[PDB]
Amino acid sequence: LYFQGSLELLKLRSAECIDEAAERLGALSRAIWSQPELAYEEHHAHRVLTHFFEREPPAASWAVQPHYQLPTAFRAEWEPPEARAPRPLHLGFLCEYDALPGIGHACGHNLIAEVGAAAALGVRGALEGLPRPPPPVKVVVLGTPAEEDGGGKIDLIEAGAFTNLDVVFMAHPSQENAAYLPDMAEHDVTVKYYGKAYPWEGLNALDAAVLAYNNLSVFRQQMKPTWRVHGIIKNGGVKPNIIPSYSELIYYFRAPSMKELQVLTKKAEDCFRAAALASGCTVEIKGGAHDYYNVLPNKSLWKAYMENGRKLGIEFIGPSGSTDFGNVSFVVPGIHPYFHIGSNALNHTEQYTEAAGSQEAQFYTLRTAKALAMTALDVIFKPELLEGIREDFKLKLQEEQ
Amino acid sequence: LYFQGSLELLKLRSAECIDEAAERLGALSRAIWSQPELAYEEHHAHRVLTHFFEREPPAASWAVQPHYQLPTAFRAEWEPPEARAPRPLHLGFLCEYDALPGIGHACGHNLIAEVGAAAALGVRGALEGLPRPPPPVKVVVLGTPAEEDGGGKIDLIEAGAFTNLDVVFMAHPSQENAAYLPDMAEHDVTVKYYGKAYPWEGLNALDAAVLAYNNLSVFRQQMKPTWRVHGIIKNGGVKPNIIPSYSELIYYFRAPSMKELQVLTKKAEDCFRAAALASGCTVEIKGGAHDYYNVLPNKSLWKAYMENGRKLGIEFIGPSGSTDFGNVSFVVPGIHPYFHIGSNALNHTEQYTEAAGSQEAQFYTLRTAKALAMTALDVIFKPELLEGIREDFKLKLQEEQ
Amino acid sequence: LYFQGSLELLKLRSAECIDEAAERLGALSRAIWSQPELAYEEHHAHRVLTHFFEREPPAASWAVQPHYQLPTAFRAEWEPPEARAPRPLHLGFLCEYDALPGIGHACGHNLIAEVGAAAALGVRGALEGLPRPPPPVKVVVLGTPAEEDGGGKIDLIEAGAFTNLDVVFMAHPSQENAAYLPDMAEHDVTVKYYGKAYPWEGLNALDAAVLAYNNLSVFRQQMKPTWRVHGIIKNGGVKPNIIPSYSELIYYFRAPSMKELQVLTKKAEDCFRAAALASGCTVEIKGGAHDYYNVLPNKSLWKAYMENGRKLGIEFIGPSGSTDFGNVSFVVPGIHPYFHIGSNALNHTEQYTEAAGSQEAQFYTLRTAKALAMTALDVIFKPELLEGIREDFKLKLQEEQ
Amino acid sequence: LYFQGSLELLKLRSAECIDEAAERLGALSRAIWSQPELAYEEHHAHRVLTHFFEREPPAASWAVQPHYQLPTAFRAEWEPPEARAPRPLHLGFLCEYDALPGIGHACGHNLIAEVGAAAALGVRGALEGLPRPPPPVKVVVLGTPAEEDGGGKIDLIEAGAFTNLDVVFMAHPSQENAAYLPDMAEHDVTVKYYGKAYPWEGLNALDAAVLAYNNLSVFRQQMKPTWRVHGIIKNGGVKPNIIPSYSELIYYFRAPSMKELQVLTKKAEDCFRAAALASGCTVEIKGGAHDYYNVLPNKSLWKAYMENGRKLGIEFIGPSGSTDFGNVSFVVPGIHPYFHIGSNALNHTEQYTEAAGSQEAQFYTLRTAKALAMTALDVIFKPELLEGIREDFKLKLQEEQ
Numbered sequence A, B, C, D: 001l002y003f004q005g006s007l008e009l010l011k012l013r014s015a016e017c018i019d020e021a022a023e024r025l026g027a028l029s030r031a032i033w034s035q036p037e038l039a040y041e042e043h044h045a046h047r048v049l050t051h052f053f054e055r056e057p058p059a060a061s062w063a064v065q066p067h068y069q070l071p072t073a074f075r076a077e078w079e080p081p082e083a084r085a086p087r088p089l090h091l092g093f094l095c096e097y098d099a100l101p102g103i104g105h106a107c108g109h110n111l112i113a114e115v116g117a118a119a120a121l122g123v124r125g126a127l128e129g130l131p132r133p134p135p136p137v138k139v140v141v142l143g144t145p146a147e148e149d150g151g152g153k154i155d156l157i158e159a160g161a162f163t164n165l166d167v168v169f170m171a172h173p174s175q176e177n178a179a180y181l182p183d184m185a186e187h188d189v190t191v192k193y194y195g196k197a198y199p200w201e202g203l204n205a206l207d208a209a210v211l212a213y214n215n216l217s218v219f220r221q222q223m224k225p226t227w228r229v230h231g232i233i234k235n236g237g238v239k240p241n242i243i244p245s246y247s248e249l250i251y252y253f254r255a256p257s258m259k260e261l262q263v264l265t266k267k268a269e270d271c272f273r274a275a276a277l278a279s280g281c282t283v284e285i286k287g288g289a290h291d292y293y294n295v296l297p298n299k300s301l302w303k304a305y306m307e308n309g310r311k312l313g314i315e316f317i318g319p320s321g322s323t324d325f326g327n328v329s330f331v332v333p334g335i336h337p338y339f340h341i342g343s344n345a346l347n348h349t350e351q352y353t354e355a356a357g358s359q360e361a362q363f364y365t366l367r368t369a370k371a372l373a374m375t376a377l378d379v380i381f382k383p384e385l386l387e388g389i390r391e392d393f394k395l396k397l398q399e400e401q
């Protein structure tokens, strides 16, 4: 309540500290939105975000590590400069910023960078505005490039960037406010067929591509209704007067779990290899470098986030049904809420790029950032919540194993 | 020429002996045409043909063996009753008589029985009307049922009925007069798919049938243009509300040689097994009991037959592109000429049944029978022709091996 | 409460009246379960159910109409014999009883007949055990044959059997207790292709069936994930040596609404007609006599039923995702709850036939019948519930239009 | 015979005049073979061939028209400079020279240019070496670019280049010597599908391409065995995460006649439009600018050419089963013999490029050129042959109409 230094007063300070930084946070959003960059090519966004945390007053109070493990990734850390002779809490906030080809930031990833920077700013301000000994906490900001292709979070996982985080937060703009939305696991694959080019002495690799297409097509009747299979024939011949000795298909499969994705992938391999057997061609089946994991929910973290958004005016009920945050949620307890930004346009469409950079979207972005910061304060000052977050994380991890 | 007992005079007697038997040979044709019977069910035709050779005067001069190896097959033999203390010539004439379902004798097999009986009658009469010692010859008539399905000639081959024949003759009515027409090799197959019948827990055997159909369909572009593949989906499900756990296809393949038929059959097996792999079903691939061989030609026998038909007024240029006579031609030198019967209708059509039983067809049938009988006389009295027939048979046999 | 003639006391009497009839209701179940009969062939079940209501004491107090509109359908009615010089309430209870081929009553329809007869018995006993003037109510039992094929309820709808009913009740055994489960709309179709049977002069009707199969197969990627399409190739040729001039497919489509089912059906027609265009065959597309409607829920009726089952010990969370009760729910407000019967077996499986006729299933059947009877008493004595049932019915009807 | 100025002596002079020019004709072949150029890009070959006829002694005795109608086409004409106050004979010889991409002159078109230039040289020398009045003849050489793609002869036909020719000659190197080989008619087509890119709101243009492929594939069973259909999927999608709204196929069809090609093309259009109907996409079907005609034979011209090659030592028994000479043969009586060049390699293969430029091929090229020149002399001095050539041309033209 009104009591001296209550948790309610700290959550207020975090909201006021975000409102005070509304101007430069909006400039951060515009800087990324105006210069859209693709996966692993976000050099300007990396410059903009690293400079942002460097200039945060007092300068160098955020320990910033540019080019952290990836050329466009970065890492910024803050803790209250104090000690007393007992493990500190590590709270992580992620910033995405890569855009889509041709249409710009049609996923509103400029707002994801803004909302992750704002939440970390609000947490520090709430702890800064605390007298007495502040509890041991380290605020960690991680710039994770290449969400839309590659999986920069996975590259960071392989570098050990998430091994010492206790909780991780981010948020993603969408069409409705939901503390959790089902993002599925994904496996990418490239299929190449090789034949030999008098057509009686011919192995038709284009036949193999079409037969593979037919094999998967009739299989759709027996897929679990939650499964997804989409693919194209990238290469289906060059000239009609020569038997195509080469064909190439590119597919990706999605299932709500790693176990179900393995069954779907084996079923697809059977379809690809059957096309080789029927056509006489040889086949190479090459999976992508990284499989995307489904996002594990965290019940305790979820319920605490919803209670904070309710006080803020958020009414609760994604874009791509898979994200590399799923790999993160498998190693660190996290939440990935989606938030409405004042538009009816769909993600990955041109009209969403308009909404992502609009002035109307800034209110919804900064409001959701406030909810993330207050939820982070909840974990800091409620040990029973932190244990409940860990129990929910351990239980969910056993089922998915 | 006019000389006492010339080969020209013997060929005339064979023609006169056939003309004299025109009445009862036509009755033989009508008896089979009027009561059409299917493969291995030709009990009446067997009765009619056995009685025919039994009543040939003097009675029992034809040694007739009814129910020879097959219930509806038979065997009739004649030789001049004389000896002198040096291997005799065995000349075979085949009679087919099985009809087609529904449309009757749309292949004119009633005329095949007539033409084989007439040729053997003409040969005996030409030798009967010879004074002095007649050369050692045995005229053998073989009733071969089930040409249109099963291959009764093959059943007779397995009984050793052709192991002591030197030359074999028959003729088949068609649309044009040709001393030889390309009949191909054939392999029949029945394909059965087995799945398991909540459709996510389903193996769709109907998918396997359709995928097998697609696999063979695109393969048609790479088949040799002389190859043929035809098939049906005999069983493709029973009720739509149950995943079909069983499917059944029936196919036959044709190629001009045994070697090429093996390549086509292996290619088809790959298509059938690929459908099993793509659908998850198991597959049984069951070939027919008998493969049909292509008909080997005999150049010497061919040229001698054409020279005899030319003197008779026949002008030279089939129904099913495969016949069990091909298996016979592989073990005995033979000819299988086709002859026009005064009709434009196609074989295996209702309007050919009309032509096969017409009065107009009797002249063309008895004329071709005359050509067969004279050709048989050529082999009897020209040792240089018999050796040339055997050399052509040995050479053709090596290529097809 | 304990008050003289409370609604709570009437619900108790209905439960006691059902418990008293447990013996003969179980005999009713066994009589139908032991002699399984198919759609429109349920002559014995019709005899058993009509005799049941005739012998209910005092005899002829149930006005029974055998062979009502359908040969195996029936109608039984009861009202308190009294008047006073104001429209009476008509409450309907449905009895299903047709079984499945081969596996018997694998849907537990013997229990559906029992539960509908028991609920109507319990309502009459609760009203019988009421002194003073009883409110004007007519209990109507309708025997609806051919649920699993045909749609006997639709035949009864066309006879006007539901035009004077205010509320209608039934229940269906399943795996879990749910006051409502999504049953979809369904449209059946039979597709026939006609060609012309020298294969160059051939229209292949089997090609049309396979091409239609392929057209629908690739369409599955673009169907709404709630849609369902299942079909078979009933006729795909007779002999491989003749081009198939005829083919036949049987399909059914399911969508959660009539509007969505029309879009799916037009899309399928495009696939069927495209196969005709590609093959050159003509096509006949014949829809089933009756389309099945999706089941409209009724919120007020639903919530009242759940509150009654809770007092009975039922814990709340189908077989065929479509039923002719959906057509009934479109013209009369109704509920179609599913109830667990002590088994893990799935509907339409052999092991569910075991559960449907077991002694263990009688407790769950009679318990759910008690819940139906108490819910019927709620409608009789709560005018605010009846109006709320009608408002929910009118609102739901506008959306589905 | 030996008589003063016999036709036999003129044919000898034509052979001696070709033998004398063997050196510079071989240089002509090497100049084109060493610098392979593609359709309509044969600038160097045009320079080489125009300069060849310009430098033929006496210079400018060949009236050469460079850049004739096409940039790389040309025209050279010679006649004996004399008059007398009765229509002259126009004899045409064609030179091809365009090569194949990547593999060079794998069709030996360098030899086609050489053989057409040599035959025209031999004819002029035979007429030059004639005293007295020479009959009125004009030797016309036409450079026809872009045989392997485009049809430069057709461009020349549209300019009227063949309207005043009486007979036309060329020759094409192959594997065996044949005065005529069946080259078929050809029709090219490009098929484009347009859809609309939430996959439930999607028209899949890749489905249209695959369905079109399946439609044509099953059609192969019913094509006439002389027909040919080959095609590729040039564009079958770009990224798997977007429904392909565009697809592109490229096909060509071949039939032995224009009438049969029209039936095959309509059947293919039905397959392409059916894919549009099944997928919901719109389709554009665009045929090539020029259809290729089948080559009409000329019996009289054929028999005269074979009699000349026999005297030369040629023993008689193509690459692409269609050529733009077929369009020429439809408007001018012509022959297009194929000739062996000392190699077993196949046309359009790398090893044929080796043979085309070898020293071994020069003897066979110059020998066939001698046969063309003598055949041209036959037409000049046998009026009964010229009339027979025209009667055969008129009769063959009526059947193909």
Ligand SMILES: N[C@@H](Cc1c[nH]c[nH+]1)C(=O)O
Residues within 6 Å of the ligand: A147, A148, A149, A150, A186, A252, A292, A320, A322, A323, A324, D241
């Ligand atoms: N198929 C998507 C999946 C995805 C990952 N991140 C965003 N989208 C891709 O191309 O990467």
Ligand SMILES: N[C@@H](Cc1c[nH]c[nH+]1)C(=O)O
Residues within 6 Å of the ligand: B147, B148, B149, B150, B186, B252, B292, B320, B322, B323, B324, C241
């Ligand atoms: N496929 C044909 C082949 C044949 C053999 N004999 C006559 N026809 C069959 O059913 O037997």
Ligand SMILES: N[C@@H](Cc1c[nH]c[nH+]1)C(=O)O
Residues within 6 Å of the ligand: B241, C147, C148, C149, C150, C186, C252, C292, C320, C322, C323, C324
């Ligand atoms: N497809 C099912 C649908 C159904 C209606 N009732 C029960 N099941 C049928 O054959 O009728």
Ligand SMILES: N[C@@H](Cc1c[nH]c[nH+]1)C(=O)O
Residues within 6 Å of the ligand: A241, D147, D148, D149, D150, D186, D252, D292, D320, D322, D323, D324
């Ligand atoms: N399909 C061949 C046909 C052809 C014409 N000339 C030579 N080849 C082409 O691409 O042109």
Ligand code: NA
Residues within 6 Å of the ligand: A020, A021, A022, A023, A024, A025
């Ligand atoms: Na600011």
Ligand code: NA
Residues within 6 Å of the ligand: B020, B021, B022, B023, B024, B025
């Ligand atoms: Na007689």
Ligand code: NA
Residues within 6 Å of the ligand: C020, C021, C022, C023, C024, C025
């Ligand atoms: Na009782």
Ligand code: NA
Residues within 6 Å of the ligand: D020, D021, D022, D023, D024, D025
């Ligand atoms: Na020279």
Ligand SMILES: [Zn+2]
Residues within 6 Å of the ligand: A107, A148, A319, A320, A347, A348
């Ligand atoms: Zn995105």
Ligand SMILES: [Zn+2]
Residues within 6 Å of the ligand: A107, A109, A147, A172, A319, A320
């Ligand atoms: Zn995104």
Ligand SMILES: [Zn+2]
Residues within 6 Å of the ligand: B107, B148, B319, B320, B347, B348
């Ligand atoms: Zn036949």
Ligand SMILES: [Zn+2]
Residues within 6 Å of the ligand: B107, B109, B147, B172, B319, B320
């Ligand atoms: Zn036959």
Ligand SMILES: [Zn+2]
Residues within 6 Å of the ligand: C107, C148, C319, C320, C347, C348
């Ligand atoms: Zn059922």
Ligand SMILES: [Zn+2]
Residues within 6 Å of the ligand: C107, C109, C147, C172, C319, C320
């Ligand atoms: Zn049921």
Ligand SMILES: [Zn+2]
Residues within 6 Å of the ligand: D107, D148, D319, D320, D347, D348
């Ligand atoms: Zn070429």
Ligand SMILES: [Zn+2]
Residues within 6 Å of the ligand: D107, D109, D147, D172, D319, D320
């Ligand atoms: Zn060429």
